[PDB]
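question for whoever is on the cluster today: can someone run the full assembly for these? six chains, 828 residues total. i dont have access anymore since they changed the login thing
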Amino acid sequence: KNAKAQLPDEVISYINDPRNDITISGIDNINAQLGAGDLQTVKAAISAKANNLTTTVNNSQLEIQQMSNTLNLLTSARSDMQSLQYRTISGISLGK
Amino acid sequence: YDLGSMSKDDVIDLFNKLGVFQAAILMFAYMYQAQSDLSIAKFADMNEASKESTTAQKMANLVDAKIADVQSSSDKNAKAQLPDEVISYINDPRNDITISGIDNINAQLGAGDLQTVKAAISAKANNLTTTVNNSQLEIQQMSNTLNLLTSARSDMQSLQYRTISGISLGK
Amino acid sequence: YDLGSMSKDDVIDLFNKLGVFQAAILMFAYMYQAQSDLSIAKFADMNEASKESTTAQKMANLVDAKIADVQSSSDKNAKAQLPDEVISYINDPRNDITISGIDNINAQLGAGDLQTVKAAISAKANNLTTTVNNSQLEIQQMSNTLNLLTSARSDMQSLQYRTISGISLGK
Amino acid sequence: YDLGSMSKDDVIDLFNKLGVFQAAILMFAYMYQAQSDLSIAKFADMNEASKESTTAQKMANLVDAKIADVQSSSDKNAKAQLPDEVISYINDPRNDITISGIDNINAQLGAGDLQTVKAAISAKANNLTTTVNNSQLEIQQMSNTLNLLTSARSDMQSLQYRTISGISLGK
Amino acid sequence: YDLGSMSKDDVIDLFNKLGVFQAAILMFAYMYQAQSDLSIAKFADMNEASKESTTAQKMANLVDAKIADVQSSSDKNAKAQLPDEVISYINDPRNDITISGIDNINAQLGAGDLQTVKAAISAKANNLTTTVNNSQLEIQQMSNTLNLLTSARSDMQSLQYRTISGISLGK
Amino acid sequence: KNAKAQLPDEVISYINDPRNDITISGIDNINAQLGAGDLQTVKAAISA
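^ ran it for u. tokens below:
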């Protein structure tokens, strides 16, 4: 009914960090027994941490528009002084 | 994310980092989790009242095999012993019969001993109109709101899309 | 930049330095900040009404472990003590039961003592249809306008681009 | 380029070499890769719940060939053996039947043995309204944002063109 | 904002500042507040008629403990004193019994003294079919309109959104 | 839960100048505790 599989705590005990938390007792290599209550809730908590993507498009989409529009203006203003510089000097003929 | 351990002002420091819309979905998904945990815990108690019956009427069929052997014999009473390996589950949190010492007495009265152990043990198995009577009002109040807690979360997930999708970079 | 401390005529001295378009975005971003602070503070109160439930039904499971030990014994009442280390959280801003002195009495009545402490403490956990009833009108009025305050700010940020981009130096 | 191994300040040394626009596309293409890896891993679990059905109802057709041979005979029960080479896949992580030792007993009851092995094994195959119920909210939230992550990347790729195309060498 | 103190022409100076739509929601929210204050005040009077019963039948159980002690003794009448610390709440706005001076007389007649103090005090506790009879017509008229006052306010809050959302700045 | 990091006030107390302002109490080397409410709003003001 339960096969006593130990967790790969060499990686999956990275929970002891700035991380999430599970409301289950002492975890360290207990030969995790409940495939429906122990192993099925460590994944169902650790994967809901991985849904942090619609929150970063929501937060930073207004300011990216305001800071990418002006970069198109700061290139195209510099590329116009570099042209007016050419036609200013190129009309000056030495001697002639 | 659990919110059963956090303080109030800590949660506001979690919502401001999240933005306004992801605050709302985390508010409704935590509201949906607690009602869904409440209703499933309610369905567990009703299922015990059914599980207590499918073992109850199971034993009553086993006594009926012994009434098939008492009556079919030539004598007035055939001395059939009870299957006490299962049917002496009465010595438990259970019912009770007002008949003397039961344990493997080669049960003699097909009309007074075997006919009343079944007629008591099967009336224990009628515990079903009492659980529909008790839990039908509260199931209505806790299933109607689940239709509201899904359909409120599915509307913030749409307003989230049309809020951002009107923002065109450059253009 | 905060505008909750400034006077009115000082803000006009801040807008004229900024130009017309950057005035508008600072007007809408401050309008967006105050509505977003208002709604998240509203979601905090609804989340307390859910957080008050996930501790409420947690304790009711703990009393059900003791009803599993009262009834399963051989005697009529098994003298199970309450887990008062948690379940005497009733001495707080909480509910109340009309039963005498509770503290570790080896709770005897599985049908009258343990069956009514849970049946009171779990009806405290039904505080969820009352918060959807109260806060569903105002959430609509404060989420519709956030879709307008984003989409007004994202239009000034575009008109700002096409205003300046038609200006060619030299040429 | 992987960004799951790099440190933060190393990535800024990768962005400054790249320029501003190629920084943005590498930011969105890595954001698109992780959401697409998340959703396909979600669709894998739903497909296992369908793959568990197309083998389940496959075996139930095989028991129906044996009910075609039990009933069609002249005797009251025709002694058809089960195709245990496949249908004894029950000895696995599977379901269970409350009937005695099954292995090639020349299954006799077309109404009580063969009619309940199918009626149990086919009710295992109804696991489809439970997966649409569970995963329809989260599929909406993870498919709406993919339409945003494509259409944000396709706008930086256009602003990149019109930024450089206005630069004429010489002229 | 209160409108129970303002004059009529002052309120029109409050509506014109507000605009047309915010005028309408403040008109319906004040209409919703007064009906909700009316109905809750109506439910308070019905709850007093129930609260007057749960103390009434509580005392009748206390007299039944004394009838358990009068009859169980060997004498013809056991001289049980009333619990006058609670059951002499009759000296109040209450009922009345046509029996002489009551105060701690070691109540002798289990059939004529203790059997009529309960049979009077419990017929006071039957005041429940009279409150459903009186307040069932008016509860229908005041609950139907609350469904209309919510659903009128939730329609102005939507027309408000689609009025402004079609206005695109610049473009 | 909070590691008590002091601010580099040798530079970051340049706020006491013609500058911006934060609506948070007395700042000077308090071993800044809230990574989400103290350190997360001094940057979110100074970068805007």
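summary bc i know u wont read the tokens: Helices of chain F lie at 9-12, 39-46. The radius of gyration of chain F is 11 Å.
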